[PDB]
């Protein structure tokens, strides 16, 4: 119907929102995984530089791996949220014709619903760091700073990290707190009186647990890690030959990737995700579902 028209504007709103939130994601990762402070400790050459390098090994890989997961999560979660609320706004708009109808999603409901995003940027992020840090530790912990990896050996290390992460809890758990949680930690100022918000959060949870969401997120994640690998390729060059670098040389390269992964200047990375046709098709199914009676 007249939906595709409302759907098209709603998509760019979602894009504005991602770009708008990346500084916040980046800043949180960089404060919680502050490698630049460890490199500053090494610049004023200290005694325990070995100890600091083994730290930086973990932090650099954790930061970049979390950067990729959380950025892909931000994109797909916002596509869900914005298309759920958009669909409700559409129906509220269609119900102004009718009489004895009240609006379901007024501005204060929209805003409380959308604030659920704070979990991903907040405690979910922190728990993701914890889980990924544990994986990097397992995979790279006992690997000498002297060990060489080609670009593709590095790719393989990243896959071993991913397999450890994607098989204690489902990924849905970092985007949304568990239902057995006080309502208050799930949206800003959320209480049992916020019936409509609670209902939107239920339907969001349905979406996040559905297999179609699993598919879209997996596709986004594969792309993200591919693109991360592509951004690093030039540093495994010298002129068309590729080299295996020792791990200590790979650390600074991995470390710098957050600036591309979480780039509001839509790095080719984020715009990459925002233009994936798979993501766009998923969004349209979400919107068709929530905008029909």
């Amino acid at each position: 119907a007249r939906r595709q028209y409302h759907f098209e504007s709603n998509q760019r709103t979602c894009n504005m929102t991602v770009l708008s939130m990346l500084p916040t994601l980046r800043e949180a990762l960089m404060q919680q995984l502050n490698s630049e402070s460890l490199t500053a400790l090494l610049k004023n050459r200290p005694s325990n530089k070995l100890e600091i390098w083994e730290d930086l090994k973990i932090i650099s890989f954790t930061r970049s791996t979390v950067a990729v997961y959380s950025t892909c999560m931000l994109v797909v979660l916002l596509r869900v949220q914005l298309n759920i609320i958009g669909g409700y706004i559409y129906l509220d708009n269609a119900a102004v014709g009718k009489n004895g109808t009240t609006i379901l999603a007024p501005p204060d409901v929209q805003q409380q619903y959308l604030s659920s995003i704070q979990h991903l940027l907040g405690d979910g992020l922190t728990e993701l760091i914890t889980v990924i840090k544990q994986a990097v530790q397992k995979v790279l912990g006992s690997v000498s700073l002297k060990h060489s990896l080609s670009l593709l050996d590095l790719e393989q290390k990243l896959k071993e990290i991913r397999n450890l992460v994607e098989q204690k809890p489902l990924l849905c758990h970092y985007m949304m707190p568990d239902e057995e949680t006080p309502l208050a930690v799930q949206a800003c100022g959320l209480s049992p009186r916020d019936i409509t918000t609670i209902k939107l959060l239920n339907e969001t949870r349905d979406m996040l647990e559905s297999p179609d969401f699993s598919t879209v997120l997996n596709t986004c994640l594969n792309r993200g890690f591919s693109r991360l690998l592509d951004n690093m390729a030039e540093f495994f060059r010298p002129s068309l030959s590729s080299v295996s670098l020792p791990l200590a040389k790979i650390i600074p390269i991995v470390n710098g990737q957050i600036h591309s992964v979480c780039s509001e200047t839509p790095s080719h990375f984020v715009q990459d995700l925002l233009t994936m046709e798979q993501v766009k098709d998923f969004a349209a199914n979400v919107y068709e579902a929530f905008s029909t009676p």
Partner: peptide
Amino acid sequence: DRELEELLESALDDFDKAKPSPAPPS
């Protein structure tokens, strides 16, 4: 051991070399 030392001091220079670019039409 001592190959280590020159590797760690060399790697340190690579943090600045790894960051992204700036742009002219802004």
